RNA sequence: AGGACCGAACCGACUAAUGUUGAAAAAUUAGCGGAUGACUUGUGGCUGGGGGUGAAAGGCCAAUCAAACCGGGAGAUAGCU
RNA sequence: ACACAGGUGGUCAGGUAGAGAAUACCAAGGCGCUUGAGAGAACUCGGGUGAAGGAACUAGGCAAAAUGGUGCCGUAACUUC
RNA sequence: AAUUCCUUGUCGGGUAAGUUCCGACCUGCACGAAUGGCGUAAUGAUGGCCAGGCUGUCUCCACCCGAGACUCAGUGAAAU
RNA sequence: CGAUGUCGGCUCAUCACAUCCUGGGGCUGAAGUAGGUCCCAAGGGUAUGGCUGUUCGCCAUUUAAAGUGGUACGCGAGCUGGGUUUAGAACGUCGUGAGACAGUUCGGUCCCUAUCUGCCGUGGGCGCUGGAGAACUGAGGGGGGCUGCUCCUAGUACGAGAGGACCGGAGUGGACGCAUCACUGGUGUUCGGGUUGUCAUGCCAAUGGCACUGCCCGGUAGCUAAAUGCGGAAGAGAUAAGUGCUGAAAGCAUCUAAGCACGAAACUUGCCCCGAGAUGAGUUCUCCCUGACCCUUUAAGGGUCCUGAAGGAACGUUGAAGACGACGACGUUGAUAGGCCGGGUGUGUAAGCGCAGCGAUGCGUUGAGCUAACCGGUACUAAUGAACCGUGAGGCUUAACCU
């Protein structure tokens, strides 16, 4: 539950090191993001030579969330801490190597693949 | 088909064998007894009153009585009425049980819902607060405005104001029958039902494809 | 309602073991990948159980490699494969959200031994 | 909208009925018939009846128990000491309202509550 | 926020012609006393179904 | 030491909400400024209407002020209603 | 104008905690505010709490929330030192 | 610029995006030297802007505690 | 002009179509994809932010799209009061000056308890022609109609390649609406616990009052949403633009004049709800009432006695019903409420006593004690015998039967 206006931290090593969330993609009026949804982000805060700068304006894909994401029997998953991965703006796939943290089972797909090759955890 | 009366017994899950737990609503469907078979002959309509539980002896009026007594059933707590689809056929006194069931795959639950007495705009219309500071001066949840000016100069009908909300005839379409239970006489539907605990329902086949 | 007291305890599984919050359990769990249906291991402290029959459930917290997972298990899920006690522990509440709070030395649960 | 909630609030704050209560219930036990309202009545019921109970059981954390409730060492005399061993077969029902008509100065519907043996 | 027009008395008593007082409608004779009471409440000597209750 | 600092009494009145046929013809509640000074207060006295007084706002001068109140000229005058 | 939530100078000033005439609870002493009984709708007023987010509200962070004590460490630009 | 019409001047800073704000330029419609010019530490219930924290301000409201509102008894207005 | 409050924001709409999206179609300088332009179409839908008082606009990022207008430039007895436009003050400029400038800047009181219409709910009376209890048909009225993306068909058709479909089907979202509380949570001043100050219960121990519930930590039921289910449809009919078939007037041609077929989110239905005051007051089933006697200005007339049914109302215990009425359950041949019993839940291992310790404390008895609205039972308490209202066979005419 990522809305306008939220500072995400950053799951993986792109460079950013807290970001803002500006838009939840994917509908109009569309309010909430969420498990694995894509938002569109500017960059608050990076690290002195990270691939990207502050200031940027980019996608990102939510990875964890604090509200957390609801399994299929009635178990939840919360966080401690809302995190993404920056991907790349036009076409994705994201930007950083590594990823920091753990991930859901819920960006198992086509894309997010990737994001789930790296991840150590789940 | 015809449809079943009902009493909604409450809520519980239903946990598959995969791990996926469904919420299901538990509605204890008795012997639905036929006390009336209404033919186009006498009435314009082909359709079954039916009635189910069972009442006190000496709460039933002699109207009532001797209606279900015609009939040759006991009194129930209600009689309800089914509309026929053109090729079924039922006598007087015949029972029907939830096994009618045991094929529809999908139906639709009608009870009266749970009455939230009177309700202002933003329970019942969804309306949207105004400011909650910056000024406002006694009215956070009032309506705004009802109207516009001096045309019309009247409130049209069916403007969306505060009143009664709740205790009334709603139907929920499509809803997944769980499990058909013939020997504890239950229906376990996916889903919420209308109305509170003990409510009488009435449970028909889903008329959308 | 003996007709949903009857119809739940058909499905509350049988050999759960007694834990209560403060406790180190690792829950073992079935994850399907595609065809294959592995099963993973979730340990943690106990810090939060709701006992409603078969509607119980219990928060279990775990610190993964980075920062700190609550896992809600619904504990008579088929899911939920195997609950075992690993650490008992002493505490004083029954709910333990202050650890939310606390990381390293400060969310450090003595053990219990009796 | 309140449904299935139970207890009245009785135009007061939660401290005051409180309190009234206890003063309340003190009368009762007291004086074996007190007449009050008829909703006074009917909570006194909620609140009286449970001291009765506590008290067919004589121990020390019974009658701390009903000194905490009640905060009178009389009234936790007679409880213990007449009241419960008086009931001491009747499970509930220790106490009978017999609505008497209405007050002179506000029409409020006034009732006698009072303990349901009073032989003497 | 104020009326227009005087209202008439026409208007006036078709308001009230749901104010008016119902009656009691019948009040109880009490089995011992023989007195009569609202229902459900005591006598004015302090009876109730035919016992003695009160008796100040 | 201090037209010093924090802060009650004491003096004030910055904001908000209520109130606005008020509890009140200017207040209440929650915060707010000064609080040994060009402070504040009691009792008495003095200044008066084109006059007073004014750290000046046309403010204040008995709920009245770009000229008080009362009485009189006086039934002013009113090509206006 | 009221048996009016306002205004009105001086004097006495106990306990515990506290720096204190603040504040909390109390003593001496005095009161329960001259309409009550119910119910527990919308809505208004005075408050409590709130998932995730955290000024996106808005004319404007208005309002609310937050900060808040004593001791010790430590403390920048600028400066009339 | 409390002064600038054209004007949201132009460039730069801050912002994802800044008619406001800060720095600068100077084409000052219509600054300017005791109706003072320009600086100025401290001060301000002063005006404007930014940030940290904090939050029901808001996304989007939900529940609860009280006082009215509603019903009963008594008294019993007002503008129009 | 004996007052019709004037920008903008908010809340809440509503209509038009000269249509922004979605839907149908003709022409194309239409290969496909994407377009351009024109006809039809008003069902539903139709952004969030920076700046500014701004509408507007520019910008950022979305979206299927961010329509254009009317409605006192809709909406201040609904809110605000930032702007304009009172009284204070200053700048620039004008005037000798008082002052002045839709030039600028800082500060600056927005009342109303609704009588009538309207509207949203909700009842009482009477009617519907004997009374009453239920179930209905349905005239009519309202709600609902939005849509993305992915996958298959198919990398086929088309194209030199790049690229890339129509038609048809499956899935899964956004926004919106209805329901609900099983789950995840919020609340939960009525449950349990921790703890600060102080006062009291003689005192220790234990408790209680007050300090915003003193501050807190959890939390039952209920209510709830961020939670979870469901919905918008298929289909039918009559069509718009459009496309035709046969076919003359006009021995050809021609979609039209006779005749015939297609054709869209609009229209009528299908789906959901209200609904016989539908005075056109309907239908069906069932239940109850089967006495005498006077008077007259002999009428569907009045009165007396005897009867009082079916049922309702009142009263009481009340409810996941409720402002009050209303509606629902129960009233002893009875679980309607309270209590009680058992369970559950929540809190978290009470008090007393014993042991260890100098003591704070810790350990044992002890997952203890206490547990609200929950669940299953139980007549212990309160739901009283009765009285009250409602009657006694229900008009006239005509018709068809009285088998």
């Given at each position: 539950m990522?809305?306008?206006?939220?500072?995400?931290?950053?799951?993986?090593?792109?460079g950013?090191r807290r970001?803002?969330?500006?838009?939840v993609?994917?509908?109009?009026?569309?309010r909430?993001?969420?498990?694995?949804?894509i938002?569109?982000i500017?960059?608050?805060?990076?690290?002195?030579?990270?691939?990207?700068?502050?200031?940027?304006?980019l996608?990102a894909?939510?990875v964890?969330?604090?509200?957390?994401?609801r399994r299929?029997?009635?178990?939840?998953?919360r966080?401690?801490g809302?995190?993404?991965?920056?991907?790349?703006?036009?076409?994705?796939?994201?930007?950083?190597?590594?990823i920091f943290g753990?991930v859901?089972?819920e960006?198992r797909s086509?894309?997010?693949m990737?994001?789930?090759?790296?991840?150590?955890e789940? | 088909?015809?449809?079943?009366?009902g009493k909604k017994?409450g809520?519980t899950?239903?946990?598959?064998?995969?791990?996926?737990?469904?919420?299901?609503?538990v509605?204890?469907?008795?012997?639905?007894?036929v006390?009336?078979?209404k033919?186009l002959?006498?009435?314009?309509?082909?359709?079954?009153q039916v009635?189910?539980?069972?009442?006190?002896?000496?709460?039933?009026?002699?109207?009532e009585?001797?209606?279900?007594?015609?009939?040759?059933?006991?009194?129930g707590?209600?009689?309800?009425?089914?509309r026929?689809?053109?090729?079924?056929?039922?006598?007087?006194?015949q029972?029907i049980?939830?096994?009618?069931?045991?094929?529809?795959?999908?139906?639709?639950?009608?009870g009266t819902?749970?009455?939230?007495?009177?309700?202002?705009?933003?329970?019942?219309?969804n309306?949207?607060?105004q400011?909650?500071?910056h000024?406002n001066?006694?009215?956070?949840?009032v309506?705004g405005?009802?109207?516009?000016?001096?045309?019309?100069?009247?409130?049209?009908?069916?403007?969306?104001?505060?009143?009664q909300?709740?205790?009334?005839?709603?139907?929920?379409?499509?809803?997944?029958?769980?499990?058909?239970?013939?020997?504890r006489?239950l229906?376990?539907?996916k889903?919420?039902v209308?109305?509170?605990?003990?409510?009488?329902?009435?449970?028909?086949?889903?008329?959308?494809? | 309602?003996?007709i949903?007291?009857?119809?739940?305890?058909?499905?509350?599984?049988?050999?759960?073991?007694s834990?209560?919050?403060?406790?180190?359990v690792?829950?073992?769990?079935?994850?399907?990948?595609?065809?294959?249906?592995?099963?993973?291991?979730?340990?943690?402290?106990?810090?939060?159980?709701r006992?409603?029959?078969?509607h119980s459930?219990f928060?279990?917290?775990?610190?993964?490699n980075?920062?700190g997972?609550?896992?809600?298990?619904?504990?008579?899920?088929?899911v939920?494969?195997?609950?075992?006690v690993?650490?008992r522990?002493?505490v004083?509440?029954?709910?333990?959200?202050?650890?939310?709070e606390?990381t390293?030395?400060?969310?450090?649960?003595?053990?219990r031994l009796n | 909208?309140?449904?299935?909630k139970?207890?009245?609030?009785?135009?007061?704050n939660?401290?005051?009925?409180?309190?009234?209560?206890?003063?309340m219930?003190?009368?009762?036990?007291?004086?074996?018939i007190?007449?009050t309202?008829?909703?006074?009545?009917?909570?006194?019921?909620?609140?009286?009846?449970?001291?009765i109970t506590?008290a067919?059981?004589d121990?020390?954390?019974?009658?701390?128990?009903?000194?905490?409730?009640?905060?009178?060492?009389?009234?936790?005399?007679?409880?213990?000491?007449?009241?419960?061993?008086?009931?001491?077969?009747?499970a509930?029902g220790?106490?009978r309202?017999?609505?008497?008509?209405?007050?002179?100065?506000?029409?409020?519907?006034?009732?006698?509550?009072?303990?349901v043996?009073?032989?003497? | 926020?104020?009326?227009?027009?005087?209202?008439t008395?026409?208007?006036?008593?078709m308001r009230?012609?749901?104010?008016?007082?119902?009656?009691?409608?019948?009040?109880?004779?009490?089995?011992?006393?023989?007195?009569?009471?609202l229902?459900?409440?005591?006598?004015?000597?302090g009876?109730?179904?035919?016992?003695?209750?009160?008796?100040?």
């Open positions: 990522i809305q306008e206006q939220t500072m995400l931290n950053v799951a993986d090593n792109s950013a970001v803002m969330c500006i838009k993609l994917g509908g109009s009026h569309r909430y993001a969420g498990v694995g949804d938002i569109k500017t960059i608050k805060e990076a690290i002195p030579r990270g691939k990207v700068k502050k200031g940027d304006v996608k894909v939510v964890r969330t604090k509200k957390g994401v299929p029997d009635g178990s939840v998953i966080f401690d809302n995190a993404c991965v920056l991907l790349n703006n036009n076409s994705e796939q994201p930007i950083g190597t590594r753990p859901t089972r960006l086509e894309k997010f990737k994001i789930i090759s790296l991840a150590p789940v | 088909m015809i449809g079943l009366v017994v809520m899950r239903i946990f598959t064998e995969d791990g996926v737990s469904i919420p299901v609503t509605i204890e469907v008795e012997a639905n007894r006390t009336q078979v033919d002959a006498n009435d314009g309509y082909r359709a079954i009635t189910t539980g069972a009442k006190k002896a000496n709460r039933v009026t002699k109207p009585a001797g209606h279900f007594a015609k009939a040759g059933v006991e009194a707590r209600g009689l309800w009425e089914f026929l689809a053109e090729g079924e056929e039922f006598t007087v006194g029972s049980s939830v096994e009618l069931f045991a094929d529809v795959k999908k139906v639709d639950v009608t819902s749970k009455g939230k007495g009177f309700a202002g705009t933003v329970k019942r219309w309306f949207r607060t400011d909650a500071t000024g001066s006694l009215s956070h949840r309506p405005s009802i109207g516009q000016n001096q045309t019309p100069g009247k409130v049209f009908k069916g403007k969306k104001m505060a009143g909300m709740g205790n009334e005839r709603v139907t929920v379409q499509s809803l997944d029958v769980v499990r058909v239970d013939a020997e006489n229906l376990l539907v889903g919420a209308p109305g509170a605990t003990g409510s009488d329902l009435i449970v028909k086949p889903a008329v959308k494809a | 309602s003996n949903i007291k009857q119809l739940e305890q058909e499905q509350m599984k049988q050999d759960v073991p834990f209560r919050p403060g406790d180190t690792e829950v073992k769990v079935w994850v399907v990948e595609g065809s294959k249906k592995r099963l993973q291991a979730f340990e943690g402290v106990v810090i939060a159980i006992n409603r029959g078969l459930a928060t279990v917290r775990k610190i993964s980075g920062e997972v609550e896992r809600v298990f619904q504990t008579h899920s088929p939920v494969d195997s609950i075992s690993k650490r522990g002493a004083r509440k029954a709910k333990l959200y202050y650890l939310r606390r390293g030395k400060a969310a450090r649960i003595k053990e | 909208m309140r449904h299935r139970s207890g009245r609030q009785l135009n007061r939660s401290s005051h009925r409180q309190a009234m209560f206890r003063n219930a003190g009368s009762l036990v007291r004086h074996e007190i007449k309202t008829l909703p006074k009545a009917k909570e006194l019921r909620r609140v009286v009846e449970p001291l506590l067919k059981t121990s020390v954390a019974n009658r701390r128990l009903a000194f905490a409730r009640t905060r009178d060492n009389e009234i936790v005399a007679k409880l213990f000491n007449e009241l419960g061993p008086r009931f001491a077969s009747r509930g220790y106490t309202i017999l609505k008497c008509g209405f007050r002179a100065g506000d029409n409020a519907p006034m009732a006698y509550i009072e303990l043996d009073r032989s003497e | 926020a104020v009326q227009q027009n005087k209202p008395r026409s208007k006036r008593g009230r012609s749901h104010d008016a007082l119902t009656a009691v409608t019948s009040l109880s004779v009490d089995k011992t006393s023989g007195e009569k009471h229902r459900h409440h005591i006598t004015a000597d009876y109730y179904r035919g016992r003695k209750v009160i008796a100040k």
